[model samples]
Target chain A: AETVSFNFNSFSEGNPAINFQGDVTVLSNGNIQLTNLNKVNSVGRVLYAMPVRIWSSATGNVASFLTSFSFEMKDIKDYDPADGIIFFIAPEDTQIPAGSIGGGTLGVSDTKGAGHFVGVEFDTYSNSEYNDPPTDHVGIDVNSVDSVKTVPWNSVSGAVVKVTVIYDSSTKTLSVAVTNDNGDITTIAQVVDLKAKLPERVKFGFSASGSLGGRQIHLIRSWSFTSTLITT
Target chain B: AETVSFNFNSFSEGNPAINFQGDVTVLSNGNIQLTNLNKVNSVGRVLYAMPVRIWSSATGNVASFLTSFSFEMKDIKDYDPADGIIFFIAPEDTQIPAGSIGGGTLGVSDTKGAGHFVGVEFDTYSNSEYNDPPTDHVGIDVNSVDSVKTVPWNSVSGAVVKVTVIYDSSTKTLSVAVTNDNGDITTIAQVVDLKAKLPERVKFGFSASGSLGGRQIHLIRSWSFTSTLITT
Candidate 1:
């Protein structure tokens, strides 16, 4: 069995543009804020992102393996706008997208398709063949973000909720739970089990943008990783 | 199959108090509340209680079997008055206790130990042996309103919380979960299995009162029953 350990007591201080370190990287644009990134293993590139909204390129060597992720939109300033989040595992090195900054700014452009990527999206805008709902849920797509499937949300008060996704490789089962807040407590709204589709190892992170009346705050709180393996 | 169907829908009215009901006759002093008497195959009795204040008792054939219960104060009315709640299972026809002119009252009396009861009490006043938090979380002699286990509240904040107890016939487990709002949304707590200590058929409910507080609202959402028919 392999042993993996992180410097939980210390911090990361590397390239703020693309690494997990220090006080976490606050996007240069000030819209997106990230924290508690130092838990990532240097030799290991996997980072569990509880993302709000983020964007990245498709040609980056940086790889991420997501264990679990969730997000909540406190104040969504724009509804009719094409705003959502994406995960990138590309081969090109470029700044992640910050709204409609044009080509290469939004999604990674790998040599294949919309770059070799698997994205679980929470798309909030309407495009061809897709009608945006007042409150969005979740989706899974390969290559282009346009091929996303909508996972229904139980409640849409825009209040604090929880989304949990557990991936058990031994059983090849992925379970997801979305919770709704009632009073000071939270209750499960939806649950999904996806064992048929998922890669053995893949990169994971979040990406999103603003359009039209785009002014929203996306916040991610805490995340953790657990495995059945015990150390000798 | 006995072909038995419980009216899991209603708890306040009916014949044999659901689960294990018995005959219980009593007189009230106009100031007490009687909650959770399930009338099923027999006359329903109380198995537990929420916190309560005021004075109460029972006489005649007014006692029964009970399992679990809890309660809390509402406002900062009486800081020095002796107030709290009780839990009981009494014989039929116990006289309810009538209190002092301005005091709370639930004219009920259970002198004989014929009624099997256990209570988690919150005493707000100073007694010969205890009081409320900064006072204590006590278990009492239901007949004497005497202290059995006097423990203090871990925290001083007066907020709404859920305290639950479960009883089983086999292993007999009495467990409690403290939730701030609803049962599903849990913030803190634990469960204690008490199946080994309680009688086979039982009644459960809450008894509460106030001394110097404005008013309090106590909520007990549900109580269910399950039996063990097989063993490994």
Candidate 2:
């Protein structure tokens, strides 16, 4: 069982163990704020220490893993917050696009071939271009902002939320569970083979974006991930 | 910017900075389990190294602060768990009650003169003796098990929940917000003067207890608290 954890209680420049770009800072309160209310059309991304090769050439196999994190989003102007955030696994070259819009793109970037990625999105804004529901929701995406499976959810402003995502290699299933401030749990799962969807080695991280029409502050309090190869 | 933080990602036999007693264990996964299902009657408690002096000896003095933590509770047999847990501030003598009952007492001892204490309880089981609501809820208590202000809530098994409690000395108000796995937020607030309810110095920690009839595992993932004294 291999594991990685981050508690963003403090911020330091040039931390070799993690990579961060765009509008992100460690708040005095010890939270890692990805996007602040001050930025418009801003995108922020944070990735693990290094690219992880979930698939091993020797074993010719992938592995099972679990990732969990706690975060909070608060609207500054009492208006709707556009765009959202995503927990993603992408090729080493993944980045924020120059002209990428926030609301629909959700900060995954509009670069071509970007769809060759996998992610779970916590979307707050509804954009017709993305076929989002009228209400906020969570979705599973493969290489595209458009989700293959989606579930309606409501995200409360100024409240912390915990999310857990698990991938079972044997069953070829990915499951997501979300917990709100009310202690209610909502889950969604899907079966997908990563060997066919992603690269042999990929980077994992969180991406968030904001739009001019609406903006909010996104903060991450803690995060942990564990993985095990299926040698059998 | 005075702050106290505990991630509870690992466990040791004893840490000079903190105190722990009875049934508490650090899981291999880095979470603190306050109590287990194997115990018939168990009480677990952990406290900070020093007492927090949020109140001054002066007649009109207090402090403003924020405390946040993430935790999870799971039943062993799919049955309702007895008792619950409490985040509290009390005199230095605060400890687990010798004959404390779990369900109604909420793992807080039944010892007399336990008043001089302030706490927020996330109660899972209801006991008519305590006027607890049939459903799960959160309540603010002062020197008594009976909460002065209570709000109904739901606790999801195996899901992580985040709770944020804030005290504003200027407004003489205390507020609480709970976030569950679904990203929903619920908030409740009350006006109270700590100068009238607590001593000048107090110990802060978390306490949990379990009963034979109904027991569960209570775990704490992360915690942090910050306070600023009012010199005026």
Candidate 3:
């Protein structure tokens, strides 16, 4: 197995291992402003500069990885912020689906039209269009925005959020742990075999979408990730 | 002139003298995020609460003013930032107007169809609909988005931009001076009698609008404004 790693205590101008596109901006102060009162439907993303080897075509082995990011979501009102943040893994060459903004879609899907990726979504808006659970929640999605599993996300005023994702190749398990500023923690896990479902190589990173209705503000303060895979 | 003054070295949460509506946001870091790869037709404006008395109701004498703001507009590509930033003086309670956003309108007007305001525009995109000069430039507008005069603004890589508007009652001259970080300065001035064309009192502040065309990012790092009118 070959191991590769990257770390960003904060973002800076012209970094080597990071690629940002769409609506995102790498602020001068070392953080990333993912969404800031953007247009009605805007999609901003930041991804790893190079695709990572997830499944080896020659050896039939899958990779295990750990990824964590620190972020904050806020609005002028101090409550009722809409849209959400996402951490995703996608196929190398596919087009990013349309209407993947911050509103009903969460910048990851267009419901039936949205497909072929896995993501951890910290959804704050409840949409009748998506048949949402009527409350804020963290969900695990595979090849769709529809969450196979979900956990309620309680609101805490002016809190910084921390999220960590862990994939255990041996058990085909994917787990997400979210922590708030008050030291409260919530963990959710799912079992999915990527070797039988996903591509050999994948791009991983963060994305945000929003509109005037939600006025959701997304910011990333820190991030770190590492991946281990078998290639030969 | 009542001699009113306000200074924002930076923007913070819930400042008393500031009123921000539409698409504008006050950042935690004490600056204002005006536009961020915003929606197709987005208009964000920030204004002061107390309207300034431009002309004395009794004497009809106009006020002379000085307003300056430090700003930066940039994108990942380092060039081609659109739509524009605006510093405007308008009559109170006249409505924000329609289609006052990024793109063809520059968030100030709808050409001849738009009316009742004067502004200093740092426009980056030249639109054929407005019969623009087809270059990045600064313009002075009176009751219309169309410029009475303009000056070309050459790019200087990714440098911070400064703008100051000096209104002199003695000469009926409203002058706009723009300075880039590289010491490049461009000044555009116009001659108009506000007492004849505008209302007795007016609201003043900053606004920004943009489309995906320029992925324009507008920010105000610092702002200082003062008005001195002769009113008994």
TM-score of every candidate relative to the true structure = 0.33, 0.50, 0.48
Alpha-carbon local distance difference test for all models: 0.32, 0.72, 0.72
Question: DockQ of each model against the real complex?
Answer: 0.02, 0.02, 0.01
Q: lDDT per residue, candidate 3, B1-232, as tens digits?
A: 1455566666643343456766777665666877655366666777765566677656657889898888777664643567777777888664456645555565667645266788887777787766668787887778777777778886443467888888898798998888888787888888978888788767787777766656566777887877676543
lDDT of 3 by residue, A1-232 (tens): 3454656666643443466766788766667877756366666678875567777766678889998888877764643476777788888664446545556566767746266778888888777766667788888888766788889886453568888899999999999999967678988899977877678767788777776667566777888888777543
* Candidate 2 chain A, poorest ten consecutive residues by summed lDDT: A1-10
Question: Which candidate, 2 or 3, would have the higher TM-score against the true structure?
Answer: 2
**Interface RMSD to the true structure, each candidate:** 15.2, 17.1, 24.4
- Ten residues in sequence with the least summed lDDT for candidate 3 chain A: A9-18
By TM-score: ranked, best first: 2, 3, 1
lDDT against true structure, model 3: 0.72
Docking class of 3: incorrect
Tally clashing residue pairs in candidate 1: 88
Residue A101, candidate 1: how far off, in angstroms? 5.6
